[PDB]
Amino acid sequence: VLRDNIQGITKPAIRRLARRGGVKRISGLIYEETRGVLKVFLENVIRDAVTYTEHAKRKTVTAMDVVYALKRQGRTLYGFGG
Amino acid sequence: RHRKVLRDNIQGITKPAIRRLARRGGVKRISGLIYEETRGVLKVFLENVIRDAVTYTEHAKRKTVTAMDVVYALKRQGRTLYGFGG
Amino acid sequence: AKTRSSRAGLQFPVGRVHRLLRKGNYSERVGAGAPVYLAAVLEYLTAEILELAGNAARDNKKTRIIPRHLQLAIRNDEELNKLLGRVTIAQGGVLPNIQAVLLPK
Amino acid sequence: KAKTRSSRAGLQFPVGRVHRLLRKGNYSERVGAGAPVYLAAVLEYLTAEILELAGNAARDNKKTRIIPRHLQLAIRNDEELNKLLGRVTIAQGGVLPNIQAVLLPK
Amino acid sequence: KPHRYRPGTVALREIRRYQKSTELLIRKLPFQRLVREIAQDFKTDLRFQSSAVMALQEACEAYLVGLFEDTNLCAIHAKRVTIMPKDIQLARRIRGERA
Amino acid sequence: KPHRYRPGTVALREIRRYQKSTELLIRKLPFQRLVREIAQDFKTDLRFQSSAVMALQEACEAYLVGLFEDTNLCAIHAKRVTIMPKDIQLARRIRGERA
Amino acid sequence: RSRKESYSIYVYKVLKQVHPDTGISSKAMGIMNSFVNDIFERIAGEASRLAHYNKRSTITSREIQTAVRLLLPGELAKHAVSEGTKAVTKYTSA
Amino acid sequence: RKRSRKESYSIYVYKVLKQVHPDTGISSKAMGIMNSFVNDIFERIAGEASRLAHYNKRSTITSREIQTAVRLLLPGELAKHAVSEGTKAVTKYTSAK
DNA sequence: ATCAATATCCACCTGCAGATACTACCAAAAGTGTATTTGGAAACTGCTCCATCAAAAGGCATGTTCAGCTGGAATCCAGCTGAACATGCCTTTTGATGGAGCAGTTTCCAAATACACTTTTGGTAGTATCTGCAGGTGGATATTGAT
DNA sequence: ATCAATATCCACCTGCAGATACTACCAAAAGTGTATTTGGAAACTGCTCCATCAAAAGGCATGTTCAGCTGGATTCCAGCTGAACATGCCTTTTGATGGAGCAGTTTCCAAATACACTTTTGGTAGTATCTGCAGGTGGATATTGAT
Ligand SMILES: [Mn+2]
Ligand SMILES: [Mn+2]
Ligand SMILES: [Mn+2]
Ligand SMILES: [Mn+2]
Ligand SMILES: [Mn+2]
Ligand SMILES: [Mn+2]
Ligand SMILES: [Mn+2]
Ligand SMILES: [Mn+2]
Ligand SMILES: [Mn+2]
Ligand SMILES: [Mn+2]
Ligand SMILES: [Mn+2]
Ligand SMILES: [Mn+2]
Ligand SMILES: [Mn+2]
Ligand SMILES: [Mn+2]
Known part of the structure; x- marks a missing residue:
């Protein structure tokens, strides 16, 4: 099969996320809508993370790269350093 | 001498003033209960900014709240304001 | 030789807090009382969280605090929840919460 | 005869002042010589960008003098400036004219 | 007529x-x-620069106008043209002002 | 049966x-x-610490769960129990993530 | 190699004070470490701004105190200020 | 007694204004906005540069820290143009003396 | 459609607040030159951990069927809320004045930094024993949904 | 109401991953002590601007009446989405295996800081004169709503 990577984020997985979010009933158009939102989130965080990686002249994205990226995006994350 | 007691000045935020603000916000029709709700929301906002501003004032050991006191207070609460000495 | 921490009655490292302030480019100078005050504040806030988290563990019939317990403790506490309102706790999950209109009958 | 660091860099904004503000601001132990030059150039550029668009808004409103209203129109009508200053309040700037379609009469 | x-x-x-x-x-x-009333309840004998009061009013009105904008979107979401207390409350919740 | x-x-x-x-x-x-696919668009030939990817997934899932909560409130506001694209869109707009 | 500093052994110490029979997983300890570092930065940063605003080059306990008041909600701030004053008073008398 | 000096970017903002709009003026309130803007962006960039230096255990903020900070802070096209202006200004500055 | 009531437009005007101009003045800022120090790039290397590979195994995604119940369309109507009006209060405007207290200048020492030297400690690495709880069990009983 | 199909709970058990307790090693960190330095509190006080007063007046708030049309309630049904189930695809696991490249060490020099000295300038202050546009008027055009 030849599927896009974002399509690897499956309908049941998105369903599970919604359930933890307290959602009882889900429209069929939600799944594609969620994938688009998810991609934008990742693009924004990873772009910043890689920018930190590049500045440190590294080829490896570290957890601290990501943690720093998340903080300046206002999504501070505990548990992975810093 | 000392000034008259200040009380109930939230009602100075009148219904037409609130209507005007809503119009600038693009609102066409307004429920009757909106006006008391807005006053409560406004009071919370003002209290929070003023609390921080006065805290800056006290730390500087001043008795006068400055524009910068307010600007700093707004900044740390994510309401950055231009035009008063930023 | 007696530590500034023991001198101040603290478990948290006063000397390290001072070194961290100096190297952090927060100011040209650091007063003597500043790292003591800050170390005490950090220790207190730590105690407050561990207390509530430990209670969360006991309420779940556990003796070892895990991320979930920290999340339960913080989100169930009005002031801690506010202080950490924009913070994500890894492997913390969420509070059990279902909107009333979604319940049957 | 002495040439300023601004002229040497080809800039209008003050390199010397920017360097001083960096050193006094407790941002780092040391400041490289290129840092205030680069920073002054960026600030000068962003200023030019806002003033260009603000001057256009003034012109659109048949004015020759830029007021805060024109600055607000310039920023909120430009997608990238709007993003950059999305959490900023311009005093006496007002808002963009915008009425939700469903509110219009049929 | x-x-x-x-x-x-x-x-x-x-x-x-x-x-x-x-x-x-x-x-x-x-x-x-x-x-002055609110400030007094926090600390007596305070004085205000006139520009300090104006800065507070500029910020307050900008906040409320912005809030009425979001409130309006909530009302319209519910297929209404009339803003209600629950519209304001939903807006502030999602904003994280009472989340 | x-x-x-x-x-x-x-x-x-x-x-x-x-x-x-x-x-x-x-x-x-x-x-x-x-x-890895997204990162390749910013910089080719990158490697990731395992903890880096995990940090990203913890953050991403926490974000979506939080978003679904706000989305749910928007649906209920319009007297529905079914979340729809317009619910997510309203939530993100009021959050300031868009428009 | 090198050494990586963390607050682990101090967090653990405090844990035994408040809950002598309670342990803590490594992942949970990592979260506590993130917490301490976060609050340190917030307080130090605010204290830094306070000094700058008032054209001072020194961060004293007074700046830490005002910073605490600005950053922590009501009761947390009250107790934090109390604990901070206590430790500075005690440190002075020694 | 003399009131101590209050520095601002006014004369420099004014110079740039005349470059882009020769016959356009600016009110003192609008100039106040512009000064707040420059101060704001100054601090944002300097702040990000500071963190960046610290993250990498460097004691020096160079034009490289400023450039990365600009890329982190500014949106697409603004970042692109800012970087080129910054890079140009630096290479020109060094090519002198 | 026509027509009338009213808002909207724009040209024109004038007063004036605020922008502009110029000279004087000066402390701080900024540049130039010289001496001294050193952060970090560069090259090299060890060892951490990242990518990839094979290889089952079964867990979980997917496609399908069926219908319960949800969303939305349509209809009705009570009464909320907008538009208009009369009335007159209190905000606005202008100007003056005492003096609180912000802010400028100079003095001066408690507390800061700066080293040198000594002692302690936290991070570490092996090494070995220990244990809280995940996950599996059986079986009681609570929940759900058809009658 | 009964009654059956599942879900859910509790008590108990055991393997093991991850927590612990131990010794030992060591660089960096923390303490101690002395010499030097300086930030900023204290004192004094110039002078900005804040609080307050008066007084006139009209912009705007308040309170009312009236009914248009909005929100909320009811009903209805088409069809979307949840539940269940049969496949089988691919994620997961884990265990070994190169080797990329992070990271530690050494070297050493362009570029930093430190400092003395000289020149330049942007800020303020003092007056003195333009000038863009706010706000007022009038009259032509446009919009709204009744018919
Ligand atoms: Mn009171
Ligand atoms: Mn070196
Ligand atoms: Mn049917
Ligand atoms: Mn329904
Ligand atoms: Mn006095
Ligand atoms: Mn030890
Ligand atoms: Mn179990
Ligand atoms: Mn001094
Ligand atoms: Mn009246
Ligand atoms: Mn009727
Ligand atoms: Mn309706
Ligand atoms: Mn290699
Ligand atoms: Mn000059
Ligand atoms: Mn006009």
Whole structure:
């Protein structure tokens, strides 16, 4: 099969996320809508993370790269350093 | 001498003033209960900014709240304001 | 030789807090009382969280605090929840919460 | 005869002042010589960008003098400036004219 | 025989008017008294720079206008044209002002 | 007749199940494939610490769960129990993530 | 190699004070470490701004105190200020 | 007694204004906005540069820290143009003396 | 459609607040030159951990069927809320004045930094024993949904 | 109401991953002590601007009446989405295996800081004169709403 990577984020997985979010009933158009939102989130965080990686002249994205990226995006994350 | 007691000045935020603000916000029709709700929301906002501003004032050991006191207070609460000495 | 921490009655490292302030480019100078005050504040806030988290563990019939317990403790506490309102706790999950209109009958 | 660091860099904004503000601001132990030059150039550029668009808004409103209203129109009508200053309040700037379609009469 | 605009016509006229202008919409003196009253309850014997009060009013009105914008979207979401307390409350919840 | 729970009953059961637990809900490898793909568009030939990808998935899932909560409130506001694209869009708009 | 400093052994110490029979997983300890570092930065940053605003080059306990008041909600701030004053008073008398 | 000096970017903002709009003026309130803007962006960039230096255990903020900070802070096209202006200004500055 | 009531437009005007101009003045800022110090790039290398590979295994995604119940369309109507009006209060405007207290200048020492030297400690690495709890069991009983 | 199909709970058990307790090693960190330095509190006080007063007046708030049309309630049904189930695809696991490249060490020099000295300038202050546009008027055009 030849599927896009974002399509690897499956309908049941998105369903599970919604359930933890307290959602009882889900429209069929939600799944594609969620994938688009998810991609934008990742693009924004990873772009910043890689920018930190590049500045440190590294080829490896570290957890601290990501943690720093998340903080300046206002999504501070505990548990992975810093 | 000392000034008259200040009380109930939230009602100075009148219904037409609130209507005007809503119009600038693009609102066409307004429920009757909106006006008391807005006053409560406004009071919370003002209290929070003023609390921080006065805290800056006290730390500087001043008795006068400055524009910068307010600007700093707004900044740390994510309401950055231009035009008063930023 | 007696530590500034023991001198101040603290478990948290006063000397390290001072070194961290100096190297952090927060100011040209650091007063003597500043790292003591800050170390005490950090220790207190730590105690407050561990207390509530430990209670969360006991309420779940556990003796070892895990991320979930920290999340339960913080989100169930009005002031801690506010202080950490924009913070994500890894492997913390969420509070059990279902909107009333979604319940049957 | 002495040439300023601004002229040497080809800039209008003050390199010397920017360097001083960096050193006094407790941002780092040391400041490289290129840092205030680069920073002054960026600030000068962003200023030019806002003033260009603000001057256009003034012109659109048949004015020759830029007021805060024109600055607000310039920023909120430009997608990238709007993003950059999305959490900023311009005093006496007002808002963009915008009425939700469903509110219009049929 | 007397002339009457339909309900909503003047409201729309007012939206266009106030979105075009930049002047403060809350009366100056009553707002100053509110500021002094609230501040006094936090600390007695305080004085205010006049620009400090004005900075507070600029920020307050900008906040409320922005809030009414989000509130309006919540009302419209529920297929209404009339903003209600629950619209404000939903807006503030999602904003994280009472989340 | 064979056994069937009414529509909504199992949904509520799942809600209680996943609000009780803390495990990640997106499969690891597909998420990892997505991350590397996106990063390749910014900088080629990158490598990731394993903890880096995990940090990203913890953050991403926490974000989506939070978003679904706000989305749910928007649906309920419009007297529905079914979340729709316009619910997510309203939530993101008021959050300031868009428009 | 090198050494990586963290607050682990101090967090653990405090844990035994408040809950002598309670342990803490490594992942949970990582979260506590993130917490301490976060609050340190917030307080130090605010204290830094306070000094700058008032054209001072020194961060004293007074700046830490005002910073605490600005950052922490009501009761947390009250107790934090109390604990901070206590430790500075005690440190002075020694 | 003399009131101590209050520095601002006014004369420099004014110079740039005349470059882009020769016959356009600016009110003192609008100039106040512009000064707040420059101060704001100054601090944002300097702040990000500071963190960046610290993250990498460097004691020096160079033009490289400023450039990365600009890329982190500014949106697409603004970042692109800012970087080129910054890079140009630096290479020109060094090519002198 | 026509027509009338009213808002909207724009041209024109004038007063004036606020922008502009110029000279004087000066402390701080900024540049130039010289001496001294050193952060970090560069090259090299060890060892951490990242990518990939094979290889089952079964867990979980997917496609399908069926219908319960939800969303949305349509209809009705009570009464909320907008538009218009009369009335007159209190905000606005202008101007003056005492003096609180912000802010400028100079003095001066408690507390800061700066080293040198000594002692302690936290991070570490092996090494080995220990244990809280995940996950599996059986079986009681609670929940759900059909009658 | 009964009654059956599942879900859910509790008590108990056991393997093991991850927590612990131990010794030992060591560089960096923390303490101690002395010499030097300086930030900023204290004192004094110039002078900005804040609080307050008066007094006139009209912009705007308040309170009312009236009814248009909005929100909320009811009903209805088409069809979307949840539940259940049969496949089988691919994620997961884990265990070994190169080797990329992070990271530690050494070297050493362009570029930093430190400092003395000289020149330049942007800020303020003092007056003195333009000038863009706010706000007022009038009259033509446009919009709204009744018919
Ligand atoms: Mn009171
Ligand atoms: Mn070196
Ligand atoms: Mn049917
Ligand atoms: Mn329904
Ligand atoms: Mn006095
Ligand atoms: Mn030890
Ligand atoms: Mn179990
Ligand atoms: Mn001094
Ligand atoms: Mn009246
Ligand atoms: Mn009727
Ligand atoms: Mn309706
Ligand atoms: Mn290699
Ligand atoms: Mn000059
Ligand atoms: Mn006009």
